[model samples]
Target: MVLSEGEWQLVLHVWAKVEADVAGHGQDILIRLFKSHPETLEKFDRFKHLKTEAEMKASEDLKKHTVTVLTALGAILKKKGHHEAELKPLAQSHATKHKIPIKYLEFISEAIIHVLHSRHPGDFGADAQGAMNKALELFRKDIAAKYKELGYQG
Candidate 1:
């Protein structure tokens, strides 16, 4: 779905707050993902062994990785529906080098949704959620084809 201008604006506005708190909220989202789907941790060699808040908090690599991801997501929000143009390098690496499947990407989306709801609570309304989902769908379309071309099963 193409997000309306207002919806995209809301996306950007909400993301500004998220970006500001990336170190905290970003790790929170990833931690939730790890808790909800333990198998997802296997994809990230750097973070796969982390099983507690202490481990996550002590790991500089995990914090750096979360910042990278949240920064990319912020860029995608700025680009509106043109995430593919901005995300190709990351997508290609994830597909070919990392062998990350589309399902794992979807798990990230789920984590983002959870973070939006749980972190901001009443401030993240339906419009913001829809905008975020639509943005993720666009990202999925671009990455899925790359995954398919690279013969990665997602």
Candidate 2:
């Protein structure tokens, strides 16, 4: 991932907090994404009708999808230097089948940082935030490459 040593440490520390409740944290990320990009809600069948705050947060479909997304990233990260193994099919599926735009995946990086800082304001200093931004950019660009490789220019 080319993260600086201290940056990697910082990311690892907060990622553990996220790992504590993977699904819950994952849901928080998506919820934040929806609020920031309301248009994105239409892209998901599970989210299209979740207009109310309570409905969005309480929806089982939202929960399940968030968990799957988070778990998939976990698997990719675990692969270390080989994220493309997981990324290619994901890019293809979203681009061809779901027709999701790449900006939303980019938004997840912001959503993740938001959740981390909101979850632990005191602990998540600028250094930690920088580390996450740095590492997650790797994620953003990796998926972006896969998207482009699959012939989806946008």
Candidate 3:
């Protein structure tokens, strides 16, 4: 099923904090999300059953990358009303490089936001939500442009 924009926001929020919380809270968050959204099991399964050492490295590498991204995001864009425009292109570029399906991107975004909201409470305030909304809108726009640029019709 296709997810809505709100769902994607939730997932991105949660993913930002996963490594900070690590195993205990991180795993718990995933468990709860997995239980609530059982279909996500396949996504997690892909991470777990990677065939190559390089693929496995991505699991760990992503955690570090997320920390760096979130840190930069928080430091550069957090609470900055004007700089929000910069986020969408970055998000779209990452999505493209990672080969993240539109469906999976929505799922991850929803999952992460839900997890972060539950865990961190006030990390994202109303302004953040508003900014994220704008960012997401532009993100879709940028992604579509990327598709066109890459000679993809869909």
Candidate 4:
């Protein structure tokens, strides 16, 4: 869960490049997430009806929603690691209400990683991906703990 100092820098560097385009990056990530896991789209009342890419892209709701999601994620990365204080409240809200599957959490990570890889190509590198993936997985596991307590297994 703890990235080496170098790993943190590697992850942060790519993030810095994309930070300028949170909406652009987040829009792609949400589309990628929904395409890869249609069930996740179903979970979102606001965007569940969106089908085509054009329809998906047309939703300012989806755009704002993804920004909300990514900004939360950005906050987590800024904290670096082991962020129980931040993770716990969101986990509780999801577990008690949204009942999101851990797989959905994972799909979001995969989608983001895909966007990063495509955005930076091989310059993203195996080592940087390793670090980024580890950091996301580390966050996901903390969220998963709440799901487990509520009887939703990944």
Candidate 5:
């Protein structure tokens, strides 16, 4: 997206080192977002808690989905920018799948962990927020590059 790979990686690596308090804030917000956004929850089945014997099993599905989304975004970025031709279809597909307003995709990209933390206070904090923001920042940057391709600068 907006940030380069090096920049995004640095941000992610740093987030892993954030204090627990900040990470709690991030997790809490995400829980809230999911609770409030049932559509998102339904579309992304990973939102539900799984009472499995294995702890690693819990986030694996979600991590997989996240990787898929990131991979898609990465492809767009690799093309040198996020063009509407590429993004619009993906956005619309996600929106339709979730039955959420397309506009929510904008917010989805912008306030991921923050929204979750609002839903589940103390679950995660600043570290989560930092990581999510870094990803989104890169996403926004890629979209900007796409816009630039269309001779549109914002």
Candidate 6:
């Protein structure tokens, strides 16, 4: 899905604010994901035993991992075309090395939308949401294609 100019403006506006606190924002997103889908925590050996969101937040490894993810996301957002090339290798490696399912990565779009809404309060409008959704759809599509190419039946 292509984002309209207005949609891009809306998304970029809020993202600019969130960009200042990438680590914290990323931390919150991962926490939200784990809380919403407890099964996802099992994929992370460091988080598998954490019984509470607070504990997950307190884990440095979780924070570091989130930072890495958010940093990659920020970089991809900055350079759109590079995302397909950059993301493909990571997707393939995760599927091959870690055996991470594509569905788990698919869960990120929901988590990100929730985070964007929460961060922006009532200011995150439909335009912004649509833009974010479209961006995520494209990213996930690329990752899914690489995952499938890597011989993951899922």
Best by TM-score: 4
lDDT of 6 at 48: 89
Ranking under lDDT, best-scoring first?
A: 4, 1, 2, 6, 3, 5
Flag regions of model 4 displaced more than 4 Å.
149-154
Off by over 4 Å in 6: 4-6
RMSD of 1: 1.7
TM-score of 1: 0.90
All candidates: CA RMSD (Å):
1.7, 1.9, 8.2, 1.7, 8.9, 1.9
Compared with the true structure, model 2 gives a TM-score of 0.88
Report the C-alpha lDDT of model 4 over 1-154, residue by residue, as the tens digit.
4778788778788888778888988899999998888888888787888878889988898889888888888887878885767787788777777778788888888999999999986548899998899888888887787678766665
Worst 10 residues of 2 by lDDT: 76-85
lDDT for model 3, please.
0.49
- Say which candidate scores most in lDDT: 4
What lDDT does each candidate get? Answer: 0.79, 0.78, 0.49, 0.83, 0.48, 0.78
Error of 6 at 17 (Å): 1.7
Off by over 4 Å in 3: 1-46, 50-62, 68-98, 125-130
User: Which is better, 4 or 6, measured by TM-score?
Assistant: 4
lDDT digits (tens) for residues 32-142 of candidate 2? 988997888888875787877678778888888888888887776555435766887888898788877768777777888888899976658998898778778887777
Candidate 1 lDDT tens digits, 1-154: 5778887887777787786678887788788788787888898887788878779877888988888888887887798877667777877788777777788888888998898887775557887788778777877877787677667665
Give candidate 2's total backbone clashes: 0
* lDDT (tens digit, per residue) of candidate 6 on 18-120: 7888889998999988888778888877678888988877888888999898888777766543567678778867888777776777787688889989888
TM-score of candidate 3 on Cα atoms, chains taken together: 0.44
Predicted candidate 2: what Cα RMSD to the true structure? 1.9
TM-score of each prediction = 0.90, 0.88, 0.44, 0.92, 0.39, 0.88
Candidate closer to the true structure by lDDT (higher is better), 1 or 3: 1
